[PDB]
Amino acid sequence: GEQKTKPTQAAIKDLRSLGLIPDMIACRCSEELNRSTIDKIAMFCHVGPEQVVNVHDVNSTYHVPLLLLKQHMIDYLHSRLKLGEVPLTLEDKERGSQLLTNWENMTKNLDDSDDVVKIALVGKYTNLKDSYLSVTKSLEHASMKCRRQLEILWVEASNLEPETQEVDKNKFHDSWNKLSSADGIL
Amino acid sequence: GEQKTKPTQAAIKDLRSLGLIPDMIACRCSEELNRSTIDKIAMFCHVGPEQVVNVHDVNSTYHVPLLLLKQHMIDYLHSRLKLGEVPLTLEDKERGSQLLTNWENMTKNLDDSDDVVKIALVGKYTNLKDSYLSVTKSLEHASMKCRRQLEILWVEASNLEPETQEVDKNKFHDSWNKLSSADGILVPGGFGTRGIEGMILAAKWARESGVPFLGVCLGLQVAAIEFARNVIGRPNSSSTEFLDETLLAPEDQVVITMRLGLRPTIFQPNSEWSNIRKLYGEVNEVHERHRHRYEINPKIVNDMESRGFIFVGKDETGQRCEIFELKGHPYYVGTQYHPEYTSKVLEPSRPFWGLVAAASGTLGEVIKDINL
Amino acid sequence: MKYVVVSGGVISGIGKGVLASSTGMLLKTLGLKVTSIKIDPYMNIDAGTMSPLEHGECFVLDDGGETDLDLGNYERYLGITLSRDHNITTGKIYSHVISRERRGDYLGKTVQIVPHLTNAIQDWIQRVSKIPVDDTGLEPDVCIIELGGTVGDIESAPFVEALRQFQFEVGRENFALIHVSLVPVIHGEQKTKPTQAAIKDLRSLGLIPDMIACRCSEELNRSTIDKIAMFCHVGPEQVVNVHDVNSTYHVPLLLLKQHMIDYLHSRLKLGEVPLTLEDKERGSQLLTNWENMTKNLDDSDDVVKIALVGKYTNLKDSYLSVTKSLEHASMKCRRQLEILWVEASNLEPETQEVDKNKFHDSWNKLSSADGILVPGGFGTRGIEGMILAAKWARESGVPFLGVCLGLQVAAIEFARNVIGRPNSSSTEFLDETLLAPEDQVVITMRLGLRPTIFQPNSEWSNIRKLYGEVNEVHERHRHRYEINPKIVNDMESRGFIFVGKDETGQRCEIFELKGHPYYVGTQYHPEYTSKVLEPSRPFWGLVAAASGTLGEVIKDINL
Ligand SMILES: Nc1ncnc2c1ncn2[C@@H]1O[C@H](COP(=O)(O)OP(=O)(O)OP(=O)(O)O)[C@@H](O)[C@H]1O
Ligand SMILES: O=c1ccn([C@@H]2O[C@H](COP(=O)(O)OP(=O)(O)OP(=O)(O)O)[C@@H](O)[C@H]2O)c(=O)[nH]1
Ligand SMILES: O=c1ccn([C@@H]2O[C@H](COP(=O)(O)OP(=O)(O)OP(=O)(O)O)[C@@H](O)[C@H]2O)c(=O)[nH]1
Ligand SMILES: O=c1ccn([C@@H]2O[C@H](COP(=O)(O)OP(=O)(O)OP(=O)(O)O)[C@@H](O)[C@H]2O)c(=O)[nH]1
């Protein structure tokens, strides 16, 4: 029940040793950071409290931009990088908030959607879900435009073969249990 | 939270009105009877407390004999009916407690068993579970002899048909969810041809996939219709009871006026290889009960046998096809008789014991025990 | 006069009092004046001798009638006041004809159960159904008769025979019969043969039912309704489906959904009773008030927990009026009531020697309580436990109400623990032992409605404030003892002010203790005067004290 700062302190020493200073610390944690933990990181690193961003574990990565927007990270970087002094038109400044409102739309439509759709992804090595990362994101984008919650059913194609029922009956039936359950197949 | 006696009191008044007195009251209840409720029933009816038996709701009916044995009902009836004055030998009195200890064995083996086996029963009207009562009891007796807990998965065969996915997707997927989950399949011997195109899928699935199968009555016929359409390759071949006047050439069913009651079935000679002849103790004849009007067509038999679908048993005249086994599959058996009706609590029907054993593994250890 | 008889069934305790009360409440929403009679086939003259272990609590009337628990259900649902004559019993009616015979009023004929006793029953029902029961001196428009027990019992035989004759001595379309019946559900099938055998008993006894009310653990299937409507010669619209519901305040709105007013209006010609438009506004004004309190029952969420500290708390019917009075208070506060049922004997330390599970569950509940009620029990055996519960509430600031015995155990607590006479006691528990500090003394039951008058230095008190600061309180009594007047100025010197008394001043009836948020005691029973849309003020004050918002309630009362 205690959030530990000494691993992040030893990482700031490696940056100083290597001759770099960080402008943000992004802290990854299984909880929201306590404000006493933020104060401590802001004592050891020579940065204000407004320069530690709390990047906790969230169920969806489409939410992470709206976490950092809530945490003033644009507002900091705009003053740290003089981004208001880059030439832009009002056309460029409508396109920016038009992308922002489209992001807030798809993230709202992610949270209040309820009706499920199940897709069987039929392949090998379906335990390493990163082996299908672009497939997975592409099923998610389709799901978000349909406004239905995606469940990928991960189906190992070799387990669908009848010989698996001689090797291990648990793997044979769970594969065909999933493939029968599927509203669509990839 | 109060157990009410006035319905049972009004029922004792009807017996008195009609001039009968009851010797036992058996009280059926959602709870154990309270002893104050028993006392009250024993006040209104002129009977002692020892004459109201408490017959509460229990999960298993194999336990109900041991409930009434705990409640002195033999001991009462032995003094009410002078049953000790019926002549019996000591041989008769060993056989009685030998049945009792066999009942206590199978009920103990019901309670301490844990490992499950799942059987799909594929049929129509599977919501009225009493429409399959003898099938159900025969799967239970097989399960009890294997010492594995039976789950029947009740599968409506019409819901297996793809058109159900246009009608209601929930019913389509729950049916195939169950059929994929099954360790064995029974096509139970139904009534009225309306579900056959669904059962043809269930028979195809079992043959293509190596899953243990039993086909009873209609379960010969849908399996032979499947094997004809999918392994001989005559894709329209059919049950004459479904199409009659349509006059297709590859008739799988033909009529040979119900063939009813106990008949002899005799094994064709080249058949001791089969699991089904092995399960029957390799005895030359099988005597079993019939309730069918059709047969498999004998003109299609040597066509099917050329492809490995051997008609392992027949009527003494040889015109009538009654048992098959398909070569090479772990257990793909069909009977035109109903093996349910010959099932006993302490001696399961051999085709059902063979299916539940095939579904569990240990089919070989069962065949070994049968062969002694 | 119209008559609805609610009757019989497969079992006793089926729901006739709930359907009788709902029918009367519903008919009142047409502007009709409704009365009620309970028939009990038991032989007791009245409930005042018989203990709460059978038929629940004895109910007390303004008359001082100690009567059937069902008369309390009619008083609270209908907004009516009943006499001891509104409860018919076998004892009263056999006693009436026997007393009339020995005097010679049958003029030397042989007095037979038919006609003479069955005529006494019909003379009584007509005498009594014309009695005024409202705030206005109008005779009623409808009488509900609840026929107790089951039809086909020997004790019911004279009452069903009188009702068979009453169906003709009064016209048709002035009489209807509702029969309540059980549909068992067994292996997922709803069984009709018990209700069919009950319709045969009514035919055998010469009655036909106009409604069948079917009580079931499920909604009735429409095939089950069709079957009941085949065997009984009635349409589908005449079987009402009265399934098991979590709340009985919903049962009127079930029967309104099922056209039962609309049927009875055409079966009893109720549109031909003379009524004004004033009567027809008052009817739907009660209906909308019922829909309000039932909506406020369903969308309320915040809980309040009240400890009811007593004996025999497993027979929850022994406290039926207390329970309903806590519910009415809860509904007016818009907070979900949980009663914590606390056996007072289990609070005593010796229980921790007898069974530690019972000791800790009692104190677990009493510590959990947002308020405490000592309910006005019977027989002194639990008092040393209730003295702990009263001590706990006073030492800790927890809201308290003491009813009857709850004055007395609180004054006994305050004497032993704040005056400091540690043996001071209830004379009913010790009598011949003759201790000097007697807290209870006898001043032969003080029974029924009496006036209570507030002592002058008392407008500071929450209890005078809750009563609208009206000079008199009129409430129902059922007590034999008083607090000793010699100990009153001793207690008042210590802040335990006897805020209200009898007009003679000898008799102590309301207190409030100075400074505590709510520590009130009444020697009357405030339960019996509680109405569904107007909770009894001492209970509304306890549930408000337990919830906070006691001040906002007192403000709303003061308008
Ligand atoms: N529709 C109903 N749903 C749920 N509970 C009900 C319903 N009707 C009645 N009850 C409950 O049934 C119990 C007994 O009902 P009721 O008091 O009306 O019985 P009765 O048959 O009139 O006879 P008795 O006076 O002997 O109890 C009570 O707890 C009551 O709240
Ligand atoms: O077992 C111990 C732990 C700590 N200490 C002494 O107390 C100090 C407490 O420091 P820790 O190393 O316990 O924590 P921290 O303040 O650096 O921050 P987190 O890792 O919790 O984020 C240490 O720096 C050391 O001086 C001990 O003497 N013994
Ligand atoms: O509402 C009621 C219920 C009951 N009674 C009177 O009390 C008696 C209680 O009898 P019940 O009919 O309440 O029960 P019981 O003892 O017959 O048994 P169970 O159905 O509970 O098993 C009845 O026979 C009747 O005389 C009433 O007067 N009114
Ligand atoms: O075991 C049985 C049950 C029923 N029957 C016969 O079938 C009929 C079925 O009637 P039941 O008595 O089974 O039901 P029901 O239609 O009267 O209605 P519920 O109780 O279910 O509400 C009975 O009236 C009898 O003629 C039997 O022959 N044997």
Ligand SMILES: [Mg+2]
């Ligand atoms: Mg530290």
Ligand SMILES: [Mg+2]
């Ligand atoms: Mg009873």
Ligand SMILES: [Mg+2]
């Ligand atoms: Mg009642």
Ligand SMILES: [Mg+2]
């Ligand atoms: Mg029936």
